[PDB]
């Protein structure tokens, strides 16, 4: 069952960790799509946003607040984009919930 994020969480795969607390971990994407590209993940292994439930409300808000404070720390004041992919049509790579945060270039429209 475990995805590659389990190695990031258990620190067996070195990552550039920007923030950690008991609920979440933030690290740089190693296949970046922007000059700044990091991932915010829960420690609870929710596989996808479609499988989050009411009990996850607080955690989901926490992930968004951590995303925006990390964006400020990474100097994304002129703007950035948050992306959550669900399933195959969403292009979800890894079946552990993650928020992409992209900045440092102009992001285009549509968003894929």
> Is 98 labeled as catalytic in the residue annotation?
yes
27 binding partner (options K ion, a second copy, none; Cβ < 5 to 8 Å by kind): none
| Contacting K ion within 79-108 (CB under 5 A) | 85, 92-93, 98
Reported residue count of the chain is: 112
50 binding partner (options a second copy, K ion, none; Cβ < 5 to 8 Å by kind): a second copy
Nearest to 7 by CA among 37, 30, 34: 30
Q: How many CB atoms lie within 10 A of CB 69?
A: 13
Give me the residues that bind K ion (CB under 5 A), please.
85, 92-93, 98
């Amino acid at each position: 069952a475990p995805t590659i994020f389990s190695r990031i969480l258990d620190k067996s795969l070195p990552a550039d960790i920007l923030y950690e607390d008991q609920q979440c971990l933030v690290f740089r994407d190693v296949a970046p799509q922007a000059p700044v590209h990091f991932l915010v993940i829960p420690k609870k292994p929710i596989p996808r946003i479609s499988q989050a439930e009411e009990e996850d409300q607080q955690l989901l808000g926490h992930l968004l607040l951590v995303a925006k404070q990390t964006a400020k720390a990474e100097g994304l004041g002129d703007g950035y984009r948050l992306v959550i992919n669900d399933g195959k049509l969403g292009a979800q790579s890894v079946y552990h919930l993650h928020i992409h945060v992209l900045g440092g270039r102009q992001l285009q429209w549509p968003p894929g």
